[PDB]
A paper describes a structure:
Photosystem II (PSII) catalyzes light-induced water oxidation through an Si-state cycle, leading to the generation of di-oxygen, protons and electrons. This water-oxidation reaction is catalyzed by the oxygen-evolving complex (OEC) of PSII and proceeds through a light-driven, five-step Si-state cycle (i = 0–4) [Fig. 1(a)].
All datasets were processed at 2.25 to 2.40 Å resolutions. We evaluated the boundary of the excitation region as follows. The OEC structures in the S1 and S2 states determined in the present study are similar to those reported in previous studies.
Numbering used by the authors:
A (entry chain I): 1 to 38
B (entry chain V): 1 to 137
C (entry chain E): 4 to 84
D (entry chain A): 11 to 344
E (entry chain C): 23 to 473
F (entry chain D): 11 to 352
The structure:
Amino acid sequence: METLKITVYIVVTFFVLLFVFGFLSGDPARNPKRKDLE
Amino acid sequence: AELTPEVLTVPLNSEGKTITLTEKQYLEGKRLFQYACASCHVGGITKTNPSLDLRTETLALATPPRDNIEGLVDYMKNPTTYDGEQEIAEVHPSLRSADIFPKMRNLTEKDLVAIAGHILVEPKILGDKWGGGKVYY
Amino acid sequence: TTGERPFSDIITSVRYWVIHSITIPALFIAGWLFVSTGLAYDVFGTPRPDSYYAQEQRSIPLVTDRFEAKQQVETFLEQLK
Amino acid sequence: ANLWERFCNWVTSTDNRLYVGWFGVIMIPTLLAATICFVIAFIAAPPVDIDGIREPVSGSLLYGNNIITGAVVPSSNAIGLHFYPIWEAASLDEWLYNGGPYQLIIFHFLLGASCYMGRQWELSYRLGMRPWICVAYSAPLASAFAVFLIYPIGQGSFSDGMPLGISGTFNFMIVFQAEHNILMHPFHQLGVAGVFGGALFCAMHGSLVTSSLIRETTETESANYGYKFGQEEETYNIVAAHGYFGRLIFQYASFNNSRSLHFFLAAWPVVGVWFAALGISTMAFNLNGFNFNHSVIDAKGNVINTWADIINRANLGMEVMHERNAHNFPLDLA
Amino acid sequence: ATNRDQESSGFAWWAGNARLINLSGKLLGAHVAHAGLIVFWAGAMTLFELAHFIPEKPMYEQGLILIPHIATLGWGVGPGGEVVDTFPFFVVGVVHLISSAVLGFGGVYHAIRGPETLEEYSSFFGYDWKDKNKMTTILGFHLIVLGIGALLLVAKAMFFGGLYDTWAPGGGDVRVITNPTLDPRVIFGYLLKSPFGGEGWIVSVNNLEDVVGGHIWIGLICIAGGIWHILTTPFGWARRAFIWSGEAYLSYSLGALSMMGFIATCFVWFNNTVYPSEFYGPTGPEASQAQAMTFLIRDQKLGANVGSAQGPTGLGKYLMRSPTGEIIFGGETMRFWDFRGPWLEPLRGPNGLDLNKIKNDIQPWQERRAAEYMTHAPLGSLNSVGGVATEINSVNFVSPRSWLATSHFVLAFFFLVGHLWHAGRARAAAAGFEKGIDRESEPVLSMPSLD
Amino acid sequence: ERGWFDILDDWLKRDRFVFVGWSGILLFPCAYLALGGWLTGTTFVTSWYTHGLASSYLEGCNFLTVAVSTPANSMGHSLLLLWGPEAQGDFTRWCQLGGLWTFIALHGAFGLIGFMLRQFEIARLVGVRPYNAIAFSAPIAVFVSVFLIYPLGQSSWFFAPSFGVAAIFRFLLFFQGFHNWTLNPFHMMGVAGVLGGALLCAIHGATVENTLFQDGEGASTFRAFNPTQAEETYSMVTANRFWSQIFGIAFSNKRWLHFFMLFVPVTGLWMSAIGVVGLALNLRSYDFISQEIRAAEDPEFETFYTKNLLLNEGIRAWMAPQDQPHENFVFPEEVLPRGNAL
Ligand code: CLA
Ligand code: CLA
Ligand code: CLA
Ligand code: CLA
Ligand code: CLA
Ligand SMILES: CC1=C(/C=C/C(C)=C/C=C/C(C)=C/C=C/C=C(C)/C=C/C=C(C)/C=C/C2=C(C)CCCC2(C)C)C(C)(C)CCC1
Ligand SMILES: CC1=C(/C=C/C(C)=C/C=C/C(C)=C/C=C/C=C(C)/C=C/C=C(C)/C=C/C2=C(C)CCCC2(C)C)C(C)(C)CCC1
Ligand SMILES: CC1=C(/C=C/C(C)=C/C=C/C(C)=C/C=C/C=C(C)/C=C/C=C(C)/C=C/C2=C(C)CCCC2(C)C)C(C)(C)CCC1
Ligand SMILES: CCCCCCCCCCCCO[C@@H]1O[C@H](CO)[C@@H](O[C@H]2O[C@H](CO)[C@@H](O)[C@H](O)[C@H]2O)[C@H](O)[C@H]1O
Ligand SMILES: [Ca+2]
Ligand SMILES: [Cl-]
Ligand SMILES: [Cl-]
Ligand SMILES: [Fe+2]
């Protein structure tokens, strides 16, 4: 169970960080029209 | 069917004297009972102890008898267990314990008579619904 | 448009209101009196608050026969004293 | 273009057969976890003590259920609102007895479906669309939160969440009616207008558009071949449809503007289901339906029954029979 | 008629307030006039509550939601929450009512009389949504205002009478808080608690030392952050993540308000410390626990040994073990064993409910309190018939906790929808396609087919 | 020939504010009388002699609890004509005996026929295909099965639905307790048709509104549409790509999409109607025999199916004496099914 818990804790943190860094990676500019939104 | 003086005539004491209530008294009794008592006694049952109800037959067999105006008025001043052996003002609203049951603070003698009258008249109206519980809703 | 006068035309005309400031309250009052005189009770056979039961009875006056249903009801109505 | 930039371009790429996106990064693992656990538990899960009284209810196909009676059974009343992951149990056998799988499924599902809503916003932004399709989906999504999360919080137990099964759904609905008189609640009533109305306007708009298709085909071919995917011109005559529907009622009860017509088609069922979800969500805090029990009284004081009192008789039968071994004290206060 | 029709502004009448987006003078008025309405309701509703208030009924039998707020701050109440002086309630109402006239006056002036734009009038009061510097400065001023507000609760708690403490030894009383919790391990520890059963995240705060100390931190944090935001301008990583427009800032606030509304819903439902049950009525968990207490007391008086009474399921009829062994009330209330309240805790020992205290130490005031709370469970109908859905008419009651929880769930839900609406539009407007697809530049037509 | 029939035809088909037609001769009196009778009855008429119920504003009921209730069970399936052998021409007795219920139900039936004939008549004059009238067959199938076939299978009109809000709620609950109607797969198909219909309604309307072409400069996009314009007002191509990528599949044919929107709720209502035709005969999907055989022999076997039958048994025993007064059910307290404590 302890190994399971750390495994899940690690998997969740991995995916959550992708989400956060993904939306921090210039997302407003990722559209087909105006690409200067700063 | 209507609320006649016969409906509103109830036992005043145990010696057999009756008293006839006005429709005003009866309706005041209903409002005051809703104010001070229905949270536990809605419909003539007792939510915190369903073994005891407010049916007239149950009140007649209490000690002392509670099936008349004087018995019920005394009960609102100094309530006792069903056998009369113990005084329960500390756990049951009463004039004697109006300091810990503040809703009893603004009840007058005339109010206690009206509440008593409502308790005695209502079974004459509702029959088994009074004190019967959910089975008779 | 299908030829009838527009509704916004009519209900902002003085003559519409001269007529309907009378006829609307008049019907309203006729409906009031239909209840207040007790006439609605007797037209439709609806019990008044003191007419659902006899003083001691607790039974419903339920119709139980098809072809004497009319007499059953008239009988129930007598038994109200 | 470094590796992180390459990854971001693939995640947000509009050329993937199914759009991934950043919401997709959370959606895909959580929905797969919930789906795999649901399928396995529906087939093979042992009976679950839903009400905490050591009275296990059988939900899975292998333990005597068919498609109609089977369910994933809500987690134990003894757990209440405590978090019960696999690693809080001493064994998988304990976890299963206590309804662990229910918690794992609904928490993963609710996250996934919330990200599904976000993903609807996200692809519309990548395609240069207007953004509000995801607002339409908030009505079914809010509804799922109501019966899987909000109602358990207010009543204090996931054991009162909706079961994951067909007959379990009916159980939840009947007990809900006994404990909140939802049929007499105006928010459920608006929900019924929402879905009856939605179904009415669905058939209506379908019949009207279909009734005014421009002749492009012969009797031997399906009329659907008269529309070509991507063609510039409209495929039905909306002036004809309005000319018909306006005479069916009267002219000013009919839409001639396709934009406002289609907005109405969106708004009516979505608003109605929002209210239905708010019904469950506020009855979750015991603000119940209208109570007219013994409201009509005659001159003496006899109760004159109404249809509301007949409803109450049926509610009492549900109340006194539900969870027949679970109550020791006279009032069912949650 | 500047931007007061659809042709000139682009906005139909049903979206008419969107015509204010770039008219800071009239937008100022609309905000001040609306604040007047809020302050108006606060004062007027308080006076209405006071006029309809009987001192000797419980507050929660009277449909009161604002007098309970005033009473929790220590005003008008004595031991046990008994009302001793209704004049504080009167003052709070009158002063809010009077102030609303001042705000209404300024709102109506700026809205229809004053300059429609402030930028040509004043460079301090004028602003550009696109000006990240000015926006964080206006933000900074208001963070400082908010932080003073939290320090005022502390000043009341520590220097001006104190707060009502439902946990005070004796039965509950106003108490001056002299040692508020300052240890950041405690204060921010609440932020890291799980929100699930038995933990409750910040809803679980259960003593005024923690409440007061948490507001000291919040006060400093807001004041500190407001200076930071006056003195700084958003960094590049922040510049690239946000939309910088008026509708965007509105959408961020709407998301924040939704989250607060949901938290507030749970606070009033579970917490009986900053929402004392003396004033708000028992929580749902509380009343359910109180029923088991009541019948354990009744039956033990009749001679039952409640510790060994086996119920129909095999679980104890009155007492049982929680999944981690604690002794807890039996029956369906097994779900509510995380409940804590001042009338129940004296029966609690290290292992939970303590059988020797149950047999020997139950005082009549606990029997009274349990019977009161069991008969004021937060259950009732929409027309305020108290009780279960099958109960008959008689008792006019719906708990204040149900009114407050349901209203704010509904409001929080619609503010989440508002967030989605306005954030989606803000994104589309900034990118330039909120009015529709350009026929001669439709993005999908320049993309390869999926198959 | 321009005889009286053709002259009358002309006048009946004048393009006026409210079209009349030949169908209007049937539709308008019957629709007006059905509505007026419901309004008359819920305002003034009791259900004391048929049901033991107050049911009108005059008695103190509100919008949720008024009804025009069904006649007494002793009336059987009588037409209850005003001039019939029960009322014998007496308007007051007729109301007290439930005559308004047959009045409403019968004129309602013929009014619905009239409304569907109107859809045919107007479609023929304007030159459109009659798919709207075809879709309206589903409401008619529902009305006929629930309000006419179902009680004709039963003992009497008494058990048809009464015309009122709370009265219909009681009907829903009666069908759960006595018929286990949630278990019926014909009802299930109806539920799918209705919920799927609402889904299609929301998703089509939302999709159109969010793939609009920018055909104007205003922020209110409603103005940028012209009923006679030739071009589509939203992008089917973008709509198709979005849904393909969100959901996997998408519509590509606009004619199929709108036919499907007709098909789903219409078919659902037809399916539910067939189920009710079965309940007319008590031909229920009440039980799974395999479940009952196992549960009878194995007192540890429990499913949501056995849990729901316990609820139905409670509904039957607790509502039946008041809901079926002509039966004179006297159930002493000791026989009522109850769990522990409640
Ligand atoms: C909190 C609610 C609220 C507030 C504060 C505002 C405020 C405003 N609206 Mg908005 N609006 C609202 C709700 C609100 N609105 C709603 C619900 C709708 C839907 C109908 C609209 C639809 C709408 C449209 C279509 C337009 C506005 C416009 C405006 C602005 C100019 C109004 C004007 O010039 O009228 C002049 C009106 C009068 C001269 C009549 C009387 C107005 C006064 C203020 C009433 C005061 C009464 C009060 C008792 C006085 C107390 C004084 C006392 C304290 C001394 C103003 C800032 C306009 C705008 O944006 O302009 C750029 C505009 O075109 N609104
Ligand atoms: C503080 C919060 C806030 C603010 C400042 C705004 C501001 C705005 N909104 Mg947003 N909105 C919000 C919250 C907010 N909204 C929420 C919570 C939702 C979800 C429902 C929305 C959903 C929304 C939509 C769908 C739209 C806007 C739009 C707008 C713009 C035009 C609004 C207008 O003139 O309405 C005029 C006001 C009315 C027409 C009044 C509506 C009356 C309501 C529905 C009745 C509510 C009943 C009441 C509560 C109880 C009954 C009372 C009765 C018995 C007397 C304006 C910028 C428009 C826009 O996009 O512009 C860019 C637009 O289309 N908003
Ligand atoms: C925080 C909001 C809030 C809460 C929790 C309460 C709670 C309460 N109020 Mg108060 N009140 C409020 C705001 C609130 N009120 C406001 C804004 C006003 C001015 C109108 C009042 C004026 C007022 C008076 C005059 C009285 C109360 C009373 C009460 C008590 C009884 C309530 C009742 O019976 O409702 C009945 C239930 C309803 C009316 C249901 C309303 C349904 C609404 C219209 C649905 C709307 C949904 C949503 C907003 C619209 C979304 C649209 C969508 C398209 C986006 C209860 C404690 C009574 C009391 O006991 O005082 C001591 C009383 O007499 N209130
Ligand atoms: C927070 C909302 C707010 C904001 C941002 C403004 C901003 C402005 N006002 Mg407006 N106004 C407001 C509310 C507001 N006012 C209110 C409530 C009223 C009614 C009293 C007015 C009545 C008003 C008039 C009649 C005029 C203005 C004018 C102005 C402009 C010049 C102000 C100045 O330089 O005075 C200098 C600054 C001061 C004198 C400091 C005042 C300090 C106050 C009075 C003491 C209390 C402040 C403290 C925070 C109290 C907290 C109360 C709060 C908790 C409710 C400026 C754009 C002028 C204008 O538009 O010119 C064309 C103008 O003629 N205002
Ligand atoms: C009204 C409140 C408020 C608002 C709207 C802002 C707004 C802003 N702040 Mg400011 N700030 C504030 C108060 C506020 N601040 C206060 C009180 C302080 C003192 C503590 C600061 C100290 C501060 C610093 C040092 C900085 C900002 C910065 C900013 C900008 C970037 C925001 C951002 O990216 O957040 C996004 C949030 C994150 C990236 C961290 C959250 C991590 C994830 C999302 C998990 C958390 C979610 C979880 C569910 C929360 C639950 C509770 C939690 C405790 C567990 C933005 C303009 C940045 C800036 O540009 O300065 C010029 C910056 O560097 N702020
Ligand atoms: C802008 C605008 C708007 C809005 C407005 C508003 C929102 C306003 C507000 C306003 C306000 C907000 C106002 C207020 C006022 C107040 C007042 C005026 C008060 C007074 C008071 C008094 C007088 C008092 C008295 C008393 C006393 C002192 C004692 C006790 C008793 C009594 C109560 C008697 C609208 C929408 C219309 C639209 C157009 C534009
Ligand atoms: C007073 C008090 C207290 C305290 C409190 C505190 C201390 C609090 C704090 C709090 C806090 C400290 C909070 C925070 C929050 C945060 C948040 C809420 C965040 C958010 C974020 C976001 C939302 C982001 C987003 C994004 C992403 C994620 C990606 C990129 C882009 C963006 C930006 C969009 C206590 C309890 C002791 C007691 C009672 C009283
Ligand atoms: C039966 C019968 C008949 C017939 C009669 C009729 C035809 C009647 C009609 C009647 C009518 C024709 C009535 C009406 C009534 C109406 C009413 C009574 C109304 C009310 C309304 C209201 C109350 C409203 C409400 C509302 C809504 C709904 C929504 C919006 C808002 C409001 C709140 C406004 C005859 C003689 C042939 C023969 C014998 C039998
Ligand atoms: C619990 C959550 C903790 C979150 C901590 C947040 C701290 C914020 C500090 C700033 C971090 C942002 O770091 C972010 O990362 C990536 C590289 O990895 C950068 O690089 C990005 O550049 C541009 C931005 O338009 C994108 O086109 C490109 O795809 C991407 O590589 C972002 O420009 C940078 O802003
Ligand atoms: Ca700054
Ligand atoms: Cl059950
Ligand atoms: Cl229990
Ligand atoms: Fe369409």
